[PDB]
Design a protein around this nucleic acid. Structure first.
Ligand SMILES: [Mg+2]
Ligand SMILES: [Mg+2]
Ligand SMILES: [Mg+2]
Ligand SMILES: [Mg+2]
Ligand SMILES: [Mg+2]
Ligand SMILES: [Mg+2]
Ligand SMILES: [Mg+2]
Ligand SMILES: [Mg+2]
Ligand SMILES: [Mg+2]
Ligand SMILES: [Mg+2]
Ligand SMILES: [Mg+2]
Ligand SMILES: [Mg+2]
Ligand SMILES: [Mg+2]
Ligand SMILES: [Mg+2]
Ligand SMILES: [Mg+2]
Ligand SMILES: [Mg+2]
Ligand SMILES: [Mg+2]
Lengths: 236, 111, 158, 109, 376, 46, 176, 322
RNA sequence: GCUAAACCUAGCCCCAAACCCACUCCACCUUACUACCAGCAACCUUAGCCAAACCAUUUACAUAAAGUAUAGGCGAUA
RNA sequence: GCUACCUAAGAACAGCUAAGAGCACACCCGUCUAUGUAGCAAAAUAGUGGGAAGAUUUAUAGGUAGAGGCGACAAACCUA
RNA sequence: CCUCCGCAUAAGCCUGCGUCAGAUCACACUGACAAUUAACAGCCCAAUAUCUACAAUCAACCAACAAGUCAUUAUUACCCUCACUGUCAACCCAACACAGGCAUGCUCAUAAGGAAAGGUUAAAAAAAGUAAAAGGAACUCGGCAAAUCUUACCCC
């Protein structure tokens, strides 16, 4: 069992890094997840998910320039090479973010909420009620974990004392601080849902081995479960 | 020398100097109509090409100019009454080319 | 390590079971080695420290097959050296507490040629024995000249 | 599939055949272009004497007598380290400053 | 998030044995032996220094302990520095006005079309035993054979004999900007050198007409975004020749672009920007050498021109430096972009549209030939 | 198909699988060498 | 030149060359280290003379002219390589006191046996070595059963050998 | 399977064996402002140009001397383009390889499953000259075809494997520096530079002091026959349709200081023993000795200079096709 | 009358007695049999066939007391 | 080291017609037939056929192991 | 007269039709002696920093999606030179001198490479072919096979 992860890089960069596939195997060598292995070969573009990341010897808000909106192999959401200051980084493009725009990364939570445009990124208390947000944080400084898939957006429901309330695309609620940053607009590459794979072999291009041929009898778990929507999840 | 340990040289140690050389060579008749000026030896297996060049010019004072080496595999398919193999010992072969057109040919021993 | 019967009942299935003791991480101050150890101690040693009135009395008193440890017998080696070398253990300017501490644990303190060899496993007492009598060889010059200078000692009296 | 054969350099693939070699006692090292750097200092030069005016030949004659052995022990050779060691009434402490060290044997043959 | 997955990281040292925690007894380690043992707990070895010096096993001193550690961070532009904002980022570092055509002093120099095509199709078809020779072997050959077309005009003009090309020449030039200590560095291409300097192009009437327009500012991009961000750097600036060298004056820099992969190629809008700072760096290296170090306006402005790359498409440039005061008077640059000799080549015929360079244009060699005869 | 040629030999793959380094690597494999020096084999490995 | 690989051409094909009395190791003790060093390069010049001849005796299918002088010379160098090795091992005891010119130590291998592990002369300390720290000199007590089994296999062969000779001596005493 | 013939050889007496493989007889002899430009392209590399890298001893033939020749030639083509109008219309190639494949003699195959069968034994010279000059028209003749030159071509008495000359099987190219549809098919001057295995010093540290001149002449006999012989094959001529006119080119060899000048003329291609039993045509190579172009440099000045070595370059760069 | 037949003696077994063994030179944990360059490390109840005419608890691993006291689907057996 | 799958970095795919397209070689598979059945062969030969720019084929090294591996389930395959 | 092969390389094996001698379908078996020469191929790199958005496809238009096989710089450290190893063959994996298995590059009919017949007679049966009057599926489980090339429809 000689498996080191390919995930070994200590400095952020722009250039595509040589990704190694796994086929669903562990660090041991047995399979864990099935239907994985043998797609087109790919390279990883390192995404900075912490959207407000201040540069060295830089403090407050700043701006960037959308250089190119590429196509990302490793994820459903196509990305943007964006540059501000003396550095470049990849971010997940929002929809209608064409090349040559300007995005802004606020840090102060204003006395009044911002007229937030389609791509910018403000801390969450500075957004209106009813805005369509994405790439949210479960802690200020954590980095974006939730809404990230292509075309998806969370809506800021209402703002209570030191918190804000987000509805995730599974229509589940969420309790986070107003300090934590979240970008505005839906994630780009919308109408990804209505693509047609077309042939059986295109799944093998994406890296999806076929389902196994053993007929499993459907147990009691397979009924349509109309269940009440889960409670508020608190990160505070 | 052979069957000995060499001193290990780091960067600025002395020259490695060999007294009482352990390895003995032998001069053969070539079997395949070698050129004139080319004279063929039988190096023992632990001896370098430049280790032969300095060995002839040191002791035998032969102005040697070009040396080639090759390793000859001894045949192993020699079976016994015990049906176990006997390996004829593999050896190293020199091809010494003399300088100055010294022009040596192998003489007729046993007239 | 052992086996049990299924419902405390021996004509049912006989099936193995391991009983683990409960482990705690408790701070421990020693008044001889003067440090705050962090030990993975269990409850029984806490109730054996308490009945012996202190940690320092626990290791020095409890016998060789009763600590059942190597970290414990390394403390016994560490503490008995402090009782036999008469170490200035605390710091200077304070000799009155040091003589008091040694007076509390005075019902102990074997000579130090014994206390080096407590708590040593056989395969560790070899390496202690090997190093002390290591003895790189004297050249035979100094032997043979000391046999000839001595040979002139049997000359000059002759 | 042959076990009792000797593993010489002639056997493996290309990566294997180039590595092993025979008992060479190699000289230099390899730098960055597969460029070999022969060190002159690690090449054994021979200390050969001259032989003219030299009285000894590879054989002796039979008329030389038979004599009994004397394995020259260290005790015997101390008895000729005595010629200054009787007048006092030759040794080196270390070999760190010596060029032909005895026990960590610096020299060859 | 922090990159650097924990398993791939260098491991923690194993927990130290408890003998080392006990004061004060001497541990019995395996260091008296000379091998690992599972009993006889592990020793703490003192740190080892190699006393002598070894070039094959050298270790550098740390970065702050190099003897040239300058916290005013330099920003080197070397040959591999690909710009972001194209020519416009280059104009701001070099304090230049762009003029969108070759000057009229050089286009009038041109007021023998089979011999161009025998330089193209020799580089693209007839050059090596391989069919379709790669771009790392027709990018130099196409510009070292167009030069020999215009070294054939030594019959008309004698002053071409005081001109050689130089292959291994470097240079360096530093200048503060606002106040960023910038730097260019040395060439990787041909440097045609002349015994005499060049005639200036813009008159002082047209030089002092360049006080008016503002330089383009490309906010939020920093102007030094993708130069080599750089501590230890040795601030000195120098053209890469010793003094007293005959042929000191550069005429043209023939910068090239090999690396037949298109990501490795220099993306033509970015390649105009590169050869500005190579033209500016060679010009400023003279003004630091002929004159003093005085941040001034030049009395006699120095002119360096440069021809592009990339054997299909050509990029012509002349460039007049007239200020070594950076930080009103501005330099001015004439560029001619995307000239593109020979639209496409067919190395072997397609099936009808036969073998040969389709879409030839003779005029881009005529602009090429103009910049060669500027000295004569 | 035909079913005899199930030893497609190579020497990298032989010594990585049944070499002396592989036998001494695992404590289970060290017992293999001991059972072969006990019996007194001529080749304890490959 | 190359002619000193060969003897005098008045001896070519003579089938008898009169060369006897190999150098007995007592006679080499009397000579100096200068002259023993010059003697080595004379036996080298003559052993190399003989090894050409026997390789040429085998090539032309003939017997050697006089094989009896080849082993005169090889044991002469062996006596010479014995006498010189006495004088170093004489005064290595005087200046150091310690035998085994190569340093070594008794180290127990993996297989539980002890060997004389000779040393191998490195440029780094032993705690920084990639390769030497991959080597293991210890017991790992699963071996301790296989040590006993070989200890009995050695003892059984020894017990067989001691018991033949008593049976062989009895059938000799049953006859004489 | 063909023998691979290396012109820049390390073999001893490799001039004599290369004469037999090529049927060339060797003849010694031959059939002021330039000192400014030649010493300015000499002191540029060795003194005047500044290099950011420390130059090692092994790199000096690759970074100092090899950029010295293409600076020296490129001017001397441009300076003598008035003196010789053929060089303006020429093509100047840099380090662009020359290939020639021919076959010479037979051999019974000594062992194998092909034992006793006659096998013609082939050769290939795959050389890369330093830089070469090609003309659309052909040079003058230097001697008549069917010349006498009664100086007795050598023959070797053993296998050509015995000079360390090995076999490979690979692509058989016949190649003047450019492809077939190139009108500058002929060529007239070739420039070579020896590499650092074959310096003046390395062949003196080893006792082959006599083979200083030979590696100059082995590099010339081989590469010119490789060049001139390939020039004949581009004009339709081959081993059985032998050349009508003789093909000719000349070369200069360099190891930093010392320059050797060679003129070569191909008289025949019928080298196979099917076409070598009624054939009196012999190729001829004329050769100079190596002479130093300068003594040394005292860091700004070429100390002991001979300009006759500059005369024999400018003679080779003068002669014009008829 | 061909094939062949015969042969004693290698050696060995079983005990007694006695506690056994390791450096000519060089090579050997890397792909063992390789002259030469900068990180991990050992300790974990045997199970099961079998007997119980199945199997599910269970089923052996000096003399004498004694196959006794005890144990055991109080049974095979221990 | 066969095979099942996977990983890493490789390779191969003429010709013609117009895309898990068509005809069709190399190559892969093995439909139906006849021979063979201690055979050429412990599964082959001769034709005939399916695919042949891809869910293709294939060289190389590595990985997963038997209370288990793996599997486009045939309870297949894991040195006849 | 065949060429469905051949020649190299890789893998593999490790001297296995070279010379001399010999014992003993037909005279690669045995003993002794000989060779395979590096330049092609192996065997590589002084640190610590720091850089690398723009596929390949004749790379140009064009057109994509499955998103792609190749790049340094800064300073410090550095001037010893061409050692070692592979190189044979009719060959390897299949118990065999086995009609099998076996990657690539060239040759795509061959300038390489080979021999279907021990000799005879010309029975049956069997096999591999070729030719066939007239009829043309009547044969048969079925047009299987062969010979000719093609029509329509079901079931899944
Ligand atoms: Mg599914
Ligand atoms: Mg299903
Ligand atoms: Mg039972
Ligand atoms: Mg039953
Ligand atoms: Mg298809
Ligand atoms: Mg098809
Ligand atoms: Mg499958
Ligand atoms: Mg089923
Ligand atoms: Mg079933
Ligand atoms: Mg071969
Ligand atoms: Mg079989
Ligand atoms: Mg033939
Ligand atoms: Mg017959
Ligand atoms: Mg009919
Ligand atoms: Mg019927
Ligand atoms: Mg019918
Ligand atoms: Mg049919």
């Amino acid at each position: 069992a000689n498996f080191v992860s390919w995930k070994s890089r200590t400095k952020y960069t722009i250039t595509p890094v040589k990704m190694r596939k796994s086929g669903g195997r562990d660090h041991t060598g047995r399979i864990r997840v099935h239907g994985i292995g043998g797609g087109h070969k790919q390279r990883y573009r390192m995404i900075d998910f912490l959207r407000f990341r201040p540069e060295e010897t830089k403090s407050g808000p700043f701006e960037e320039k959308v250089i190119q909106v590429r196509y990302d192999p490793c994820r459903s959401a196509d990305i943007a090479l964006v540059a501000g200051g003396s550095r470049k980084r990849w971010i997940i493009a929002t929809e209608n973010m064409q090349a040559g725009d300007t995005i802004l990364n606020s840090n102060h939570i204003g006395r009044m909420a911002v007229a937030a445009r389609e791509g910018d990124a403000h801390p969450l208390g500075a957004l209106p009620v009813g805005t369509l947000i994405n790439n949210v944080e479960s802690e200020p400084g954590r980095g974006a974990q939730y809404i990230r898939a292509a075309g998806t957006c969370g809506v800021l429901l209402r703002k209570v004392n030191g918190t804000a309330i987000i509805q995730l695309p599974s229509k589940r609620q969420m309790q986070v601080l107003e300090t934590c940053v979240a970008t505005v607009g839906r994630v780009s590459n919308v109408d990804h849902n209505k693509r047609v794979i077309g042939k059986a072999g295109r799944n093998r291009w994406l890296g999806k081995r076929p389902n196994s041929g053993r007929w499993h009898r459907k147990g009691g778990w397979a009924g349509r479960k109309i269940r009440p929507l889960p409670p508020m999840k608190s990160y505070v | 020398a052979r069957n000995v340990v060499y001193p290990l040289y780091r960067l600025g140690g002395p020259q490695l100097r060999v007294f009482r050389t352990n390895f003995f060579i032998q001069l053969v008749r070539p079997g395949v109509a070698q050129p004139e000026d080319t004279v063929q030896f039988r190096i023992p297996m632990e001896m370098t090409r430049v280790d032969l060049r300095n060995y002839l010019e040191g002791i035998y004072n032969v102005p040697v100019a070009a040396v080639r080496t090759r390793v000859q595999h001894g045949s192993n398919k020699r079976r016994d009454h015990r049906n176990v193999r006997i390996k004829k010992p593999d050896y190293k072969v020199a091809y010494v080319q003399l300088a100055h057109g010294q022009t040596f040919t192998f003489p007729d021993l046993f007239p | 390590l052992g086996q049990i019967y299924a419902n405390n009942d021996k004509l049912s299935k006989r099936l193995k079971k391991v009983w683990k003791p409960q482990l705690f991480e408790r701070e421990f101050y020693s008044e001889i080695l003067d440090k705050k150890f962090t030990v993975t101690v269990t409850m029984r040693t806490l109730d054996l420290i308490d009945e012996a009135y202190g940690l320092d009395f626990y290791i020095l008193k409890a016998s060789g097959e009763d600590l059942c440890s190597k970290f414990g017998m390394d403390l016994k080696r560490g503490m008995l050296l402090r009782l036999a070398r008469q170490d200035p253990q605390l710091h200077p300017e304070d000799p009155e507490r040091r003589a008091a501490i040694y007076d509390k644990y005075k019902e102990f303190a074997i000579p130090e040629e014994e206390a080096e060899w407590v708590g040593l496993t056989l395969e560790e007492a070899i390496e202690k024995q090997r190093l002390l009598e290591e003895k790189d060889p004297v050249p035979l010059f100094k032997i043979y000249v000391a046999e000839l200078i001595q040979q002139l000692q049997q000359q000059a009296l002759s | 599939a042959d076990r009792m054969s000797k593993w010489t350099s002639k056997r493996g693939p290309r990566s294997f055949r180039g590595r092993k070699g025979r008992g060479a006692k190699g000289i230099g090292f390899l730098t960055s272009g597969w460029r070999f750097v022969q060190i002159k200092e690690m090449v054994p030069e021979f200390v050969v004497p001259d032989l003219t005016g030299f009285k000894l030949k590879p054989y002796v004659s039979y008329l030389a007598p038979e004599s009994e052995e004397t394995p020259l022990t260290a005790a015997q050779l101390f008895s000729e380290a005595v010629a200054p060691a009787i007048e006092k009434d030759g040794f080196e402490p270390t070999q760190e400053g010596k060029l032909f060290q005895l026990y960590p044997r610096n020299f060859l043959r | 998030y922090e990159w650097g997955v924990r398993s791939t990281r260098k491991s923690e040292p194993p927990p130290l044995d408890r003998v080392y925690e006990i004061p004060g007894l001497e541990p019995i380690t395996f260091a008296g032996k000379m091998h690992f043992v599972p009993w006889l707990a592990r020793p703490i070895f003192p740190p080892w220094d190699r006393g002598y010096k070894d070039p094959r096993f050298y270790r550098s001193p740390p970065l702050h302990e190099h003897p040239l550690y300058k916290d005013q961070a330099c920003y080197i532009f070397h040959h591999r520095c690909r710009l972001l904002e194209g020519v416009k980022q280059a104009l701001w570092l070099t304090k230049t006005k762009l003029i969108e055509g070759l000057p009229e002093k050089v286009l009038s120099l041109v007021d023998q079309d089979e011999c161009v095509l025998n330089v193209i199709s020799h580089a693209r078809l007839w050059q090596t035993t391989e069919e379709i020779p790669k771009r790392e072997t027709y990018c130099p050959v196409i510009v070292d054979n167009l030069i020999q077309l215009c070294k054939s005009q030594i019959l008309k003009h004698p002053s071409l004999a005081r001109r050689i090309c130089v292959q291994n020449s470097t240079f360096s030039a530093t200048w503060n900007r606002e106040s960023l200590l910038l730097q260019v560095r040395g060439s990787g291409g041909a440097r045609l050198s002349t015994k005499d300097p060049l005639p200036t192009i813009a008159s002082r009437e047209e030089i002092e007409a360049t006080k008016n327009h503002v330089l383009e500012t490309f906010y939020p991009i920093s102007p030094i975004i993708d130069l080599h961000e750089c501590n230890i750097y040795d601030v000195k600036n120098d053209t890469g020749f010793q003094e007293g060298y005959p042929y000191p004056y550069p005429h043209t820099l023939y910068l090239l672009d090999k690396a037949n992969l298109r990501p490795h190629r220099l993306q033509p809008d970015q390649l105009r920007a590169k050869m500005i700072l190579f033209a500016f760096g060679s010009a400023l290296a003279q003004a630091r050498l002929l004159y003093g170090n005085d941040a001034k306006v030049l009395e006699q402005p120095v002119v360096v021109q440069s021809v592009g790359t990339d054997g299909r498409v050509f990029h012509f440039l002349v460039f007049q430096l007239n200020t070594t005061d950076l930080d009103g008077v501005k330099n001015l640059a004439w560029v001619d972009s995307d000239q593109l000799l020979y639209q496409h080549f067919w190395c072997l015929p397609v099936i009808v549209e036969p073998v040969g360079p389709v879409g030839f244009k003779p005029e881009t060699f005529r602009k090429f030939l103009a910049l060669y005869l500027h000295g004569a | 198909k035909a079913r005899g040629n199930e030893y497609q030999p190579s020497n990298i793959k032989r010594k990585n699988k049944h070499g002396w380094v592989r036998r001494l690597s695992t404590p289970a494999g060290v017992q293999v060498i001991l059972r072969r020096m006990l019996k007194g084999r001529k080749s304890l490995s490959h | 030149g190359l002619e000193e690989f060969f003897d005098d051409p008045k001896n070519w094909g003579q089938e008898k060359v009169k060369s006897g009395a190999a150098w007995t190791c007592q006679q080499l003790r009397n000579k100096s280290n200068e002259d023993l060093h010059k003697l080595w390069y004379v036996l080298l010049k003559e052993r190399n003379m003989l090894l050409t001849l026997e390789q040429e005796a085998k090539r032309q299918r003939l017997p050697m002219p006089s094989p009896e002088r080849l082993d005169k010379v090889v044991d002469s160098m062996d006596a010479l390589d014995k006498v010189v090795q006495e004088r170093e091992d004489a005064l290595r005891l005087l200046q150091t006191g310690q035998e085994r010119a190569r340093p070594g130590a008794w180290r127990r291998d993996i297989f539980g046996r002890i060997i004389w592990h000779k040393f191998k002369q490195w440029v780094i300390p032993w705690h920084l070595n990639k390769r030497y720290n991959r080597k293991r000199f210890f017991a790992l007590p699963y071996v301790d059963h296989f040590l006993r089994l070989e200890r009995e296999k050695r003892a059984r062969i020894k017990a067989r050998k001691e018991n033949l000779e008593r049976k062989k001596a009895k059938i000799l005493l049953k006859k004489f | 399977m063909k023998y691979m013939v290396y012109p820049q050889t390390f073999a001893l007496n490799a001039d004599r064996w290369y004469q037999y493989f090529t049927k060339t007889v060797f003849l010694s002899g031959l059939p002021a402002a330039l000192r400014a430009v030649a010493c300015d392209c000499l002191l540029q590399e060795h003194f005047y140009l500044r290099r950011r890298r420390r130059v090692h001893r092994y790199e000096e033939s690759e970074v100092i001397s090899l950029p010295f020749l293409d600076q020296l030639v490129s001017t001397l083509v441009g300076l003598l383009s008035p003196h010789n109008p053929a060089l303006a219309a020429a093509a100047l190639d840099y380090r662009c390889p020359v290939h020639f494949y021919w076959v010479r003699g037979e051999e019974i195959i000594p062992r194998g499953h092909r034992r006793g069968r006659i096998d013609d034994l082939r050769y290939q010279i795959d050389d890369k000259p330093n830089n070469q000059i090609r003309i659309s028209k052909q040079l003058a003749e230097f001697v008549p075809l069917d010349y006498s030159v009664p100086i007795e071509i050598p023959t070797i008495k053993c296998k050509p494997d015995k000079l360390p000359l090995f076999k490979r099987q690979y692509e058989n190219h016949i190649f003047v520096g450019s492809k077939t549809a190139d009108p500058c098919c002929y060529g007239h001057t070739q420039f070579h530079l020896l590499p650092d295995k074959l310096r003046r010093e390395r062949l003196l540290r080893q006792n082959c002091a006599d083979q200083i001149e030979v590696v100059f002449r082995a590099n010339a006999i081989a590469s010119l026959f490789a060049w001139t012989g390939a020039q004949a094959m581009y004009q339709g001529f081959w081993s059985e349709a032998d050349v009508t006119r003789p093909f000719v080119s000349q070369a200069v060899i360099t190891d930093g200081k010392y320059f050797s000048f060679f003129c070569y003329q191909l008289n025949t291609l019928a080298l196979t023993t099917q076409a070598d039993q009624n054939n009196p045509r012999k190729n001829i190579c004329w050769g100079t000795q190596s002479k130093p172009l300068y003594e040394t440099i005292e860091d700004n000045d070429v100390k002991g200079f001979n300009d006759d070595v500059l005369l024999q370059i400018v003679h080779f760069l003068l002669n014009r096709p008829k």
